[PDB]
Assembly symmetry: D2
Homo-oligomer: 114 residues x 4
């Protein structure tokens, strides 16, 4: 139900081997680790969770953009990119969180489908 | 070698049934029709061309954003969105032109892979 | 030395009355409140800090996009937009944090100048 | 009534000395030159037109992004960024066309105000 895709606006390519961490907001308002992985050669990270585990709640997707740029020898602005959203069962069932990265900028969108 | 994908930033969805026209620049600098189609339910338009036909050159991808917004009952800013680029054989072989649409804004990127 | 500008990609307008909260990472790795305000009729928020107060550190600029969209009677995707960055680590700079908002998307950029 | 602002997402800076050409669609459906200029050290291009001259029409703002990137010694994807829109069809408005540039991507937005 959740896929993350990361793209590079400098090289015009998928952003490969980017660390991504997903958190769920707990009842005490702390962020609890939920899922993580590294983007593939296509810039995508599949298999983070299952329908059963991905209950309604507030989730945070943290993308380690700083390490990505540093590996390329480029000095970046942001410590990371954070995407925070509510999963809602009323809405469609599959969520794609996409991020387009530049050293001093990023764009993110959600594609939510049934 | 060429795919076009269009996304909607207002609804968080693929932009479905969007007309897309591709042109190649001719030797007299006019734009000659090359390929066209309508995005699918996934927001993607596949099958525009073949490796044989897609020779080095300057290409224009025109996306009929105004009709898309009007069909949704939303007043848009742009007449259309234009993406103009050189296809170069030195670079990687497959080109994805992606566009993220809002009524008064759009973002575009190229994902170019081998 | 810190300005925040917010635009609305649906209306083609400044995003007015957007709440913005800035935090600085403390010695104990917690986010300490640093400054806050609301965007003006131009979509800009000036006067958050001074060059004396805006020392080296890791800062988080949280833009309350959800509250913005709800109030235009609209249900958006994100809770907020957060921008996290190290500032002033090579001496004082001036920072503009710009954000362009849609209900299911935002884009952010920084303009960093040396006075 | 027409301003163009261009930012650089690689450098985190205004995009300076970017050439901008504006066209208006003529009665015969050709693009007629309307105005042109270069962005300043702030990334802004003011003074393109007057409210008298900037009548109703379909306008194209062409931003010469390729020439910008080449000159920073860099090979970019797009030939230019073009923004095409109807203007002043409900009377005079003020238009800001903003563009945020990367070598393989750009984003553009409009801010339209009623004076
Ligand atoms: O499967 C995808 C998805 Br999901 C998002 C994008 C995408 N996300 C974007 C954000 C700003 C500009 C262009 C963008 O393209 C591209 C491809 Br290909
Ligand atoms: O005075 C401006 C204007 Br107009 C637009 C922008 C701007 N345009 C943007 C497009 C995408 C992401 C961030 C953006 O910021 C910034 C400033 Br500062």
């Amino acid at each position: 139900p959740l896929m993350v895709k990361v793209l590079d606006a400098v090289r015009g390519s998928p952003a490969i081997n980017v660390a991504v961490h997903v958190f769920r907001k707990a009842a005490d308002d702390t962020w609890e680790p939920f899922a993580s992985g590294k983007t593939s050669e296509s810039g995508e990270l599949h298999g983070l969770t299952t329908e059963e585990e991905f209950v309604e709640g507030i989730y945070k997707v943290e993308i380690d953009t700083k390490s990505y740029w540093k590996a390329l020898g480029i000095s970046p602005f942001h410590e990371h990119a954070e995407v925070v959203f509510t999963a809602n069962d009323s809405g469609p069932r599959r969520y794609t969180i996409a991020a387009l990265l530049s050293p001093y900028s990023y764009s993110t969108t959600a594609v939510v489908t049934n």
